């Protein structure tokens, strides 16, 4: 078995063996990389996503949402509250604003320390989820609006037609912002890409330990877990690595710069934090292995996890017996 120990492993494919996505995938898995619940992928250098970024301040960030935590340094849940609409060379400016930007430090190791220590003392503002692209329609390999749909896959692998669309979402990011610990909608893989400016820090657990991380978060989290058999679908939950090794929760932790794709794998359980100011790219992905972790995936139906149109044909699809009771929670 290829990769057993689940380490995040780090590729650098070469312009040849960037040209065809679903091949490289595939022999990112045939290496072991999806034991690890995620892997680095570092373009080959004659590789770019744009010419420059220099034309990108009058990007609209329409909800930035404040990212308040209640709860103890390493066990926190964090809600979202709407702010007023503002462009990405305001919320640039914000970010850099002696209020919000990152503090001196040494070194990766320093700044992740001062995160843990100190994230729940602060509200950052986070410009999530913003429908669009900064690929340019000219990039051909890895242009994250021009993959192959998840819609098409279905199709391809199971003969059925069905309505949905699937495009990239933009985040920009500030010191502290934060993705609390959550698999993909219906276990999907994921890519992201770091446009621009300060890393982003991952955590992630092995996709045959998720069980662990979602029984550690039943117990941490207990109120919550009665409201709701899959409450990390509601995506507020956070627990530090200092809290998971207490746990002896298996996991690993990467640190990603400008320039660099990761890749998330069905179920693979991930967490982490921005260094300062960024822009990200991401959307969801599926290839054949995915299809049997859709089947199987964990549903919110309390109400609160609200998800994309298109994830109705998913779930009436591979989980008709789900659909009913998971739509009543959409409705
Ligand atoms: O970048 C972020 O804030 C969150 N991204 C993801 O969880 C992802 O790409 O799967
Ligand atoms: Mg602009
Ligand atoms: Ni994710
Ligand atoms: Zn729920």
Not at 87 to 113: C, M
Request: hydrophobic fraction near 35%; proline fraction near 5%; charged fraction near 25%.
């Amino acid at each position: 078995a290829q990769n057993p120990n689940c380490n995040i492993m780090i590729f650098h494919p070469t312009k040849e063996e960037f040209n065809d996505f679903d091949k490289y995938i595939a022999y990112m898995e045939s290496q072991g990389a999806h034991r690890a619940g995620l892997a680095k992928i570092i373009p080959p250098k004659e590789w770019k996503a744009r010419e420059t970024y220099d034309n990108i301040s009058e990007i609209l960030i329409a909800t930035p949402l404040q990212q308040v935590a209640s709860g103890r340094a390493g066990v926190f849940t964090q809600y979202h509250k709407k702010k007023k609409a503002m462009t990405v060379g305001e919320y640039r400016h914000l970010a850099n604003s002696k209020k919000y930007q990152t503090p001196p430090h040494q070194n990766f190791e320093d700044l992740e320390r001062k995160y843990w220590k100190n994230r729940i003392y602060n509200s950052p503002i986070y410009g999530a989820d913003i429908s669009g692209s900064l690929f340019d329609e000219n990039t051909k390999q890895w242009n994250l609006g021009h993959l192959g749909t998840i819609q098409d896959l279905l199709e391809k692998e199971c003969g059925v037609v069905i309505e949905g669309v699937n495009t990239p979402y933009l985040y920009f990011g500030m010191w502290k912002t934060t993705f609390a610990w959550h698999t993909e909608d219906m276990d999907l893989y994921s890519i992201n890409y770091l446009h621009l400016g300060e890393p982003k820090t991952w955590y992630v657990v092995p996709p045959e330990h998720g069980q662990r991380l979602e029984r550690l978060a039943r117990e941490l989290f207990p109120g919550s877990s009665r409201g709701c058999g899959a409450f990390l679908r509601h995506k507020v939950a956070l627990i530090s690595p200092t809290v998971l090794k207490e746990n002896g929760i298996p996991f690993n932790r990467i640190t990603q710069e400008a320039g660099e794709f990761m890749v998330t794998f069905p179920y693979g359980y991930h967490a982490g934090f921005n260094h300062g100011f960024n822009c990200a790219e991401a959307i969801n992905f599926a290839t054949p292995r995915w299809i049997d972790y859709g089947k199987m995936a964990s549903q919110c139906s309390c109400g609160e996890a609200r998800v994309t149109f298109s994830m109705d044909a998913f779930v009436r699809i591979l989980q008709p017996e789900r659909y009913d009771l998971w739509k009543r929670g959409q409705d």
